[PDB]
């Protein structure tokens, strides 16, 4: 790491200086560092140049706006200060070079969209690893090699990706937020593939607004190295973009592939939602097949198909993907299915809002031949508004609502339950059982073999907050033990 080499693409004259780390934060800027002084929203890093110098940074790269011309090399207390125009725009490229282009030394797949990013990223990372990659993820859950994900500027992105390259990662599945993209946080990453789960947002009913939003996004897209484009054709915006991208892969489970285009495509032709997952029959430009997914609900069929289409597009052989699909697992505590011979199917999901609970129940219903049970409660000492809404949802979308406790904290547990019941048309038809473990047990032990019990609100969280006490408790463990299986 040398300032002169770092800057060679942009500034030919730059002085030679050994550099340690690259940081935007003057507070942590230490001896030998490159401090990068940016102008942000109500913050100007140039103000902190004297501090950084006093802390012994080897060099500084600074926003040129108002202060200097692009490429201008100055010197303050024997420290080179190099000014660059549009530094925010170029920060990704700058950090990329500094960290030896990590995205050129592994297969990076970006996933964008409002929903399904985490799941699709997890599936990409899992499936690629099943086929022999050392895979990693970067997303909302955290960053790391698979099974080692620990819970962010353009510099942080490149640095983290370099970290992963150093740990041996050959594949990385990255969640890309709309906000990250707009702020040029992934501007210089070489994506092998970019996956769109959707491109549809609220607040775009005026066609001028839809046009500006789309224009902004198309502009951003055109500036990035997206690689193979894999787009969900079941999304309306998805379809519009597919019409403009003859090389993009169209993915559908709802009959939106237009075969006249002769493009690359992948479509589920039939899905059987059953008591332990989904059997997905599909055709594609790569060949046809049948996958046994152990994920639940229609949305996860879509996510799986997107990951499949992506890996096919990257050249992973269909036969090997088919042979490994049954090993794909859900994100822990996300529509995570528990089955045991001759017992009801039990799904653990973290759904703890009206919208999430509704979606979870609708997903569970697809796999449910008998009655759908919903075991849930609401957090105490928190916003109470969702309580009757969750009651109404449980009553509507389940056949049996079992209302119980879920982190009652210092609030009277029964009072929370009463607020839930208040939301129902027929509270008397709900079952109430206090002690969460007892409520779970009640549903699981009474439910028929062909029933499904959704246990909602905790997912992977292994505690029940009663009073001030963080009591050891797991829905997953409770369910596993009742079914005689292992969590």
Give the overall form.
Answer: globular
Going across the biggest sheet, name each strand in turn: 10-9-11-8-12-13-14-15-16-17
CATH homology-level superfamily of the largest domain: Mur-like, catalytic domain
CATH topology annotation of the largest domain: UDP-N-acetylmuramoyl-L-alanine:D-glutamate ligase
The oligomeric status of these chains comes to monomer
The radius of gyration over CA amounts to 26 Å
Fraction of residues in H or I helices: 25-40%
Top-tier CATH class of the largest domain:
Alpha Beta
What's the total count of β strands? 25
Helix run count: 15
What is the CATH architecture descriptor of the largest domain? Answer: 3-Layer(aba) Sandwich
From the helix content, strand content and strand pairing, which structural class follows?
A: alpha/beta
Largest sheet data? 10 strands, mixed
Number of domains: 3
Could you tell me how far the N terminus lies from the C terminus, measured between alpha carbons in angstroms? 46 Å
Fraction of residues in β-strands: 15-25%
GO molecular function: ATP binding; magnesium ion binding; UDP-N-acetylmuramoylalanyl-D-glutamate-2,6-diaminopimelate ligase activity
Modified residues (N6-carboxylysine): 217
Catalytic activity: UDP-N-acetyl-alpha-D-muramoyl-L-alanyl-D-glutamate + meso-2,6-diaminopimelate + ATP = UDP-N-acetyl-alpha-D-muramoyl-L-alanyl-gamma-D-glutamyl-meso-2,6-diaminopimelate + ADP + phosphate + H(+)
Keywords: ATP-binding, Cell cycle, Cell division, Cell shape, Cell wall biogenesis/degradation, Cytoplasm, Ligase, Magnesium, Nucleotide-binding, Peptidoglycan synthesis
């Amino acid at each position: 790491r040398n300032l002169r080499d770092l800057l060679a693409p942009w500034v030919p004259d730059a002085p030679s200086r050994a550099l340690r780390e690259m940081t935007l934060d003057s507070r942590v800027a230490a001896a030998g560092d490159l401090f990068v002084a940016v102008v942000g929203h109500q913050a100007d890093g140039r103000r902190y140049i004297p501090q950084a110098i006093a802390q012994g940074v080897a060099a500084i790269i600074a926003e040129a706006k108002d202060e200097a011309t692009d490429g201008e090399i100055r010197e303050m207390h024997g420290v080179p200060v190099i000014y660059l125009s549009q530094l925010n725009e170029r920060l990704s490229a700058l950090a990329g070079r500094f960290y030896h282009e990590p995205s050129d030394n592994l297969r990076l797949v970006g996933v964008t969209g409002t929903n399904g990013k985490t799941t699709t990223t997890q599936l990409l990372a899992q499936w690629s690893q099943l086929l022999g990659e050392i895979s990693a993820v970067m997303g909302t859950v955290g960053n790391g090699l698979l099974g080692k994900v620990i819970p962010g500027s353009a510099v942080d992105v490149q640095h983290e990706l370099a970290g992963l390259v150093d740990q041996g990662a050959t594949f990385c599945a990255m969640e890309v937020s709309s906000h990250g993209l707009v702020q040029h946080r992934v501007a210089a990453l070489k994506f092998a593939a970019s996956v769109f789960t959707n491109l549809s947002r609220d607040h775009l009913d005026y066609h001028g607004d839809m046009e500006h939003y789309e224009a902004a996004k198309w502009l951003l897209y055109s500036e990035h190295h997206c690689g193979q484009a894999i787009i969900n054709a079941d999304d309306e915006v998805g379809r519009r973009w597919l019409a403009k991208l003859p090389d993009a892969v169209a993915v559908s489970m709802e009959d939106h592939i237009n075969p006249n285009c002769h493009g690359r495509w992948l479509k589920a032709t039939e899905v059987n939602y059953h008591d332990s997952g989904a059997t997905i029959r599909f055709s594609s430009s790569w060949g046809d097949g049948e996958i046994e997914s152990h994920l639940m609900g229609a949305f996860n069929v879509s996510n799986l198909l997107l990951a499949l289409a992506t890996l096919l597009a990257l050249g992973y052989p269909l036969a090997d993907l088919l042979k490994t699909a049954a090993r794909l697992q859900p994100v822990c505590g996300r529509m995570e299915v528990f089955t045991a011979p001759g017992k009801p199917t039990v799904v653990v999901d973290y759904a703890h809002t009206p919208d999430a609970l509704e979606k979870a129940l609708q997903a569970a219903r697809l796999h449910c031949a008998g009655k759908l049970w919903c075991v849930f409660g609401c957090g105490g000492d928190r916003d109470k508004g969702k309580r009757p809404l969750m009651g109404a949802i449980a009553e509507e979308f389940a056949d049996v609502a079992v209302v119980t406790d879920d982190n009652p904290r210092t609030e009277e547990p029964r009072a929370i339950i009463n607020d839930i019941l208040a939301g129902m048309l027929d509270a008397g038809h709900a079952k109430v059982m206090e002690g969460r473990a007892e409520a779970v047990t009640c549903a699981v032990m009474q439910a028929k073999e062909n029933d499904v019990v959704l246990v909602a609100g905790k997912g992977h969280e292994d505690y029940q907050i009663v009073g001030n006490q963080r009591l050891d408790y797991s829905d997953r463990v409770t369910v596993a033990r009742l079914l005689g299986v292992i969590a």
